[PDB]
């Protein structure tokens, strides 16, 4: 079984018994990819335990995978653990039922209703502003995925959900607990060591009712969504709960809305807060870029002036400062469909069964599509060299019908918060800052060590 990829002439590492190459993870799954890219080439395979997995980094072999089969092959994420009711949750739902989530949620993020969430998160940038100003009244080092937690917390909940929930005014909030403790993935933990390495457990665990996600979390996340949803529906704005409501008067069940709900929750919250604490690391470590930033901010809003829709877009060298911290921590370090059947792609045979996977981490960083790929270079993403970058090399977002539906989302919830924070504030590293960052060897993108600066005035 372990022959797969000697029998098909495709190379890659030897694989060992039972764990596969498992424990090349040791030093990161990152730079195991990496490792493999720059000895085998284009395209290698190896065994997560006995799941065979094929990498490729050939841009068109993408597309294939990635757009043109979705429907017909590569439909389905890999299946990771015992998952109980959030089987339903869009990111882990398999064919038809993702088919059906993902035109009922879609509709979500439209120009229309982005443009309408500004005035809702401009406000929640003037408590954030209010907040890091104490912070800098003092000199106090900050974890920035404290604040921008809060925030961005405040932000998925109220555009969501249309609550306030005032993470930002509340250390100890609920929702920011619990959240955090969600998902805690680690290579060191036997559990999730394994079922990644022996799927084979996984049937039994649902049975006993074991979950990959804490009790406590789901319990409380389940009973906070009856509440919103509850307050909805007794008031006398369409969001993303308003629109699972109207599919419940085939066929949406209360336990299929909170499973959509929890990872709106997740994404918003965890994926949001990282990005920018990662981005204002680079900007603290690289001062110059800060403040070119910060003067196109003035250019574009003078006189401290409110970020509008149109005013985030014109702003070039922000979306430059932002796409390369992408490029450098992309939150998902690989993309990975499951082939469905037997097919040639670009004149290569993948058999049902694989886990065809992209290397994001790996591809965002080859010596081949960037020079000096290791540093943090804006410019790369100039205006210029807009059509250098090819869209199949540079997927921080994914690609095709299973893309990120929050991109455009995310994007401006960023961005409004940079805005707020850059024409405010200056970001500096101490010594309480790891520099240079190493990252977990764990789970998800996070820092070895949480991102501490301090907070300056203008
Ligand atoms: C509530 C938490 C559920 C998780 C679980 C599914 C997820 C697959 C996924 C990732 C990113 C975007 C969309 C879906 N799984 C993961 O996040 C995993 N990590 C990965 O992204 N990988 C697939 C890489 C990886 C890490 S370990 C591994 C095997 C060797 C087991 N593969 C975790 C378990 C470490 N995901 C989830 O809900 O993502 C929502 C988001 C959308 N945009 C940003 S976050
Ligand atoms: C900077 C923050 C974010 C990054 C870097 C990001 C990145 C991604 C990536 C790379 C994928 C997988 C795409 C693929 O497989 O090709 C994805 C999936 C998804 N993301 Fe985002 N994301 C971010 C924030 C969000 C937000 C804010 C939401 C909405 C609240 C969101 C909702 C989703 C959903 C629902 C999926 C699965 C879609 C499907 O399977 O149909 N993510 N995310």
Same mark, same amino acid.
């Given at each position: 079984?372990?022959?797969?990829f000697?029998?098909?002439?495709?190379?890659?590492p030897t694989?060992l018994?039972?764990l596969?190459?498992? &424990?090349?993870?040791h030093?990161?799954?990152?730079?195991?990819d990496?490792?493999?890219?720059? /000895?085998?080439?284009?395209?290698?395979?190896?065994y997560?335990? %006995? %799941?065979?997995v094929?990498?490729?980094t050939?841009?068109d072999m993408?597309?294939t995978?990635?757009?043109?089969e979705?429907?017909?092959?590569?439909?389905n994420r890999?299946?990771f653990?015992?998952v109980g009711?959030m /089987?339903?949750?869009?990111?882990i739902?398999?064919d038809?039922?993702w088919?059906?989530?993902? @035109?009922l949620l879609?509709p979500?993020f439209?120009?229309?209703k982005?443009?309408?969430?500004v005035?809702? =998160?401009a %406000?929640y940038?003037?408590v954030?502003?209010?907040?890091?100003?104490?912070?800098?009244?003092t000199?106090?080092?900050?974890t920035?995925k404290?604040?921008?937690?809060?925030?961005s917390?405040?932000?998925?909940?109220?555009?969501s959900?249309? #609550?306030?929930?005032?993470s930002?005014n509340?250390?100890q909030d609920?929702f920011?607990?619990?959240?955090? /403790?969600?998902?805690?993935?680690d290579?060191?933990?036997?559990?999730?060591l394994?079922?990644?390495?022996?799927?084979?457990?996984?049937?039994?665990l649902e049975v006993?009712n074991?979950?990959?996600?804490?009790?406590?979390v789901t319990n409380? &996340?389940?009973?906070?969504?009856?509440?919103?949803?509850? @307050?909805?529906?007794?008031?006398?704005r369409?969001?993303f709960?308003?629109?699972? =409501?109207?599919?419940?008067?085939?066929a949406?069940?209360?336990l299929?809305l909170?499973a959509?709900?929890?990872?709106?929750?997740?994404?918003g919250?965890?994926?949001?807060?990282?990005?920018?604490?990662f981005?204002?690391?680079?900007?603290?470590?690289?001062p110059d870029?800060?403040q070119?930033?910060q003067?196109?901010?003035?250019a574009?809003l003078?006189?401290?002036?409110?970020?509008?829709?149109?005013?985030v877009l014109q702003?070039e060298?922000?979306?430059?400062? #932002?796409n390369?911290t &992408?490029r450098?921590?992309?939150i998902?370090?690989? &993309?990975?469909?499951?082939?469905?059947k037997?097919?040639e792609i670009?004149?290569?045979?993948? *058999?049902?069964g694989?886990?065809?996977?992209i290397?994001?981490?790996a591809l965002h960083?080859?010596?081949?599509?960037?020079?000096? *790929?290791?540093?943090?270079?804006?410019?790369?993403?100039?205006? /210029?060299?807009?059509?250098n970058?090819?869209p199949?090399?540079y997927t921080?977002?994914?690609?095709?019908?299973?893309?990120? =539906?929050?991109?455009?989302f995310?994007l401006?919830n960023?961005?409004?918060?940079?805005?707020?924070?850059?024409?405010?504030?200056?970001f500096?590293?101490?010594?309480?800052?790891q =520099?240079?960052?190493?990252?977990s060897?764990?789970g998800?993108?996070?820092?070895e060590?949480?991102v #501490?600066l301090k #907070?300056?005035?203008r």
């Amino acid at each position: 079984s372990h022959g797969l990829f000697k029998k098909l002439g495709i190379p890659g590492p030897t694989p060992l018994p039972f764990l596969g190459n498992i &424990l090349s993870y040791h030093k990161g799954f990152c730079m195991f990819d990496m490792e493999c890219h720059k /000895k085998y080439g284009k395209v290698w395979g190896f065994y997560d335990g %006995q %799941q065979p997995v094929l990498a490729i980094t050939d841009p068109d072999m993408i597309k294939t995978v990635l757009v043109k089969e979705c429907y017909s092959v590569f439909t389905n994420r890999r299946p990771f653990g015992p998952v109980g009711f959030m /089987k339903s949750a869009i990111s882990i739902a398999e064919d038809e039922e993702w088919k059906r989530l993902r @035109s009922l949620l879609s509709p979500t993020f439209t120009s229309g209703k982005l443009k309408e969430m500004v005035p809702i =998160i401009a %406000q929640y940038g003037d408590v954030l502003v209010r907040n890091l100003r104490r912070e800098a009244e003092t000199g106090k080092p900050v974890t920035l995925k404290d604040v921008f937690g809060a925030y961005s917390m405040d932000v998925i909940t109220s555009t969501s959900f249309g #609550v306030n929930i005032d993470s930002l005014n509340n250390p100890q909030d609920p929702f920011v607990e619990n959240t955090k /403790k969600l998902l805690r993935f680690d290579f060191l933990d036997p559990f999730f060591l394994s079922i990644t390495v022996f799927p084979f457990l996984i049937p039994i665990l649902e049975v006993l009712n074991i979950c990959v996600f804490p009790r406590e979390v789901t319990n409380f &996340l389940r009973k906070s969504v009856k509440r919103m949803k509850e @307050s909805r529906l007794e008031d006398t704005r369409v969001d993303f709960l308003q629109l699972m =409501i109207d599919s419940q008067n085939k066929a949406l069940s209360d336990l299929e809305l909170v499973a959509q709900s929890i990872i709106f929750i997740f994404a918003g919250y965890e994926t949001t807060s990282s990005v920018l604490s990662f981005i204002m690391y680079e900007l603290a470590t690289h001062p110059d870029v800060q403040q070119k930033l910060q003067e196109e901010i003035d250019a574009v809003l003078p006189n401290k002036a409110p970020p509008t829709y149109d005013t985030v877009l014109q702003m070039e060298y922000l979306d430059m400062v #932002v796409n390369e911290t &992408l490029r450098l921590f992309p939150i998902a370090m690989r &993309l990975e469909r499951v082939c469905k059947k037997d097919v040639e792609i670009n004149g290569m045979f993948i *058999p049902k069964g694989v886990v065809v996977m992209i290397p994001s981490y790996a591809l965002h960083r080859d010596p081949k599509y960037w020079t000096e *790929p290791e540093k943090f270079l804006p410019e790369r993403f100039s205006k /210029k060299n807009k059509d250098n970058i090819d869209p199949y090399i540079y997927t921080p977002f994914g690609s095709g019908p299973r893309n990120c =539906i929050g991109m455009r989302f995310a994007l401006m919830n960023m961005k409004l918060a940079l805005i707020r924070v850059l024409q405010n504030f200056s970001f500096k590293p101490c010594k309480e800052t790891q =520099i240079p960052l190493k990252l977990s060897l764990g789970g998800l993108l996070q820092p070895e060590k949480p991102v #501490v600066l301090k #907070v300056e005035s203008r």
